[PDB]
């Protein structure tokens, strides 16, 4: 009789991380309650760079100032963006789907260095420091956040928990929207800071089930330059398939 290899899911995301030659943490948040997995699991308390996850709170500061709003059009002025699927006019929440940087950064611009770092410090969001460049303090340092305190996030905006409105934080949510299937939903932002070293993606988010249960995640890895940016997207389905969180 030969032994047989009992593959938990604990085991299985820690070796889903390994099978990609990179360190990440997958934290999870249900009821109040967090677990971690992966192969990396100090991560879930090291500070990180937000990079694009940070929209999700440019967002929600910049509709409850009223420095926007979620039909306003963003124009495209004619410089050459990061990607062609930019270079069109947008509202904020195409711009969250496309993580359209030039549109955030227009929106940084006009909450301005004042009221942001008061907000972010009001909000308490990482380490609360912004720094004096409005329009990069989340992609370079020095704001940063630990993938603990983003699940944290996360869940509470799935919960309309925020200290803002009901309004702005049920807006922000439509906007993140990913996924719709019998009956379960899946919102998320992507992030991936390539200009710092090491390289940080995120994919931080929630579930609601079909029952109505939030279960959120905040997925913190290494990336590094020939890496698909799906593999986020992989890494974390397969890990909520493993969990029976879909
Ligand atoms: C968000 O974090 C990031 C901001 C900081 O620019 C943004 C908008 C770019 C990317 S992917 C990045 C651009 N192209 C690189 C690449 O694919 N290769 C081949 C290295 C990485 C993302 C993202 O989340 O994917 N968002």
Do not use: C
């Not at 990482?126 to 869940?155: H, M, R, Y």
């Not at 939903?185 to 249960?213: H, N, R, S």
């Amino acid at each position: 009789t030969p032994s047989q290899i009992v593959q938990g899911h604990n085991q299985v995301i820690h070796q889903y991380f390994d099978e990609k030659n990179t360190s990440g943490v997958l934290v999870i948040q249900t009821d109040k309650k967090i677990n971690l997995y992966g192969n990396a699991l100090s991560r879930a308390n090291t500070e990180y760079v937000p990079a694009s996850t940070f929209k999700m709170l440019n967002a929600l500061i910049g509709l409850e100032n009223q420095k926007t709003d979620i039909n306003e059009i963003f124009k495209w002025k004619g410089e050459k963006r990061s990607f062609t699927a930019w270079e069109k006019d947008m509202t904020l929440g195409e711009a969250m789907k496309l993580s359209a940087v030039p549109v955030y950064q227009e929106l940084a611009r006009r909450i301005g260095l004042d009221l942001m770092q008061k907000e972010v410090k009001r909000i308490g969001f990482g380490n609360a420091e912004i720094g004096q460049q409005v329009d990069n303090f989340w992609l370079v340092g020095p704001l940063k956040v630990t993938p603990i305190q983003e699940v944290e996030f996360v869940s509470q905006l799935a919960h309309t928990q925020l200290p803002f409105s009901e309004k702005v934080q049920a807006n922000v949510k439509n906007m993140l929207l990913l996924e719709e299937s019998n009956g379960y939903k899946i919102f998320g932002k992507t992030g991936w800071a390539m200009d710092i070293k090491p390289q940080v993606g995120w994919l931080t988010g929630w579930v609601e089930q079909p029952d109505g249960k939030i279960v959120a995640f905040a997925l913190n890895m290494e990336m590094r330059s020939e890496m698909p940016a799906s593999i986020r997207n992989e890494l974390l389905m397969k890990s909520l398939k493993q969990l029976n969180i879909i």
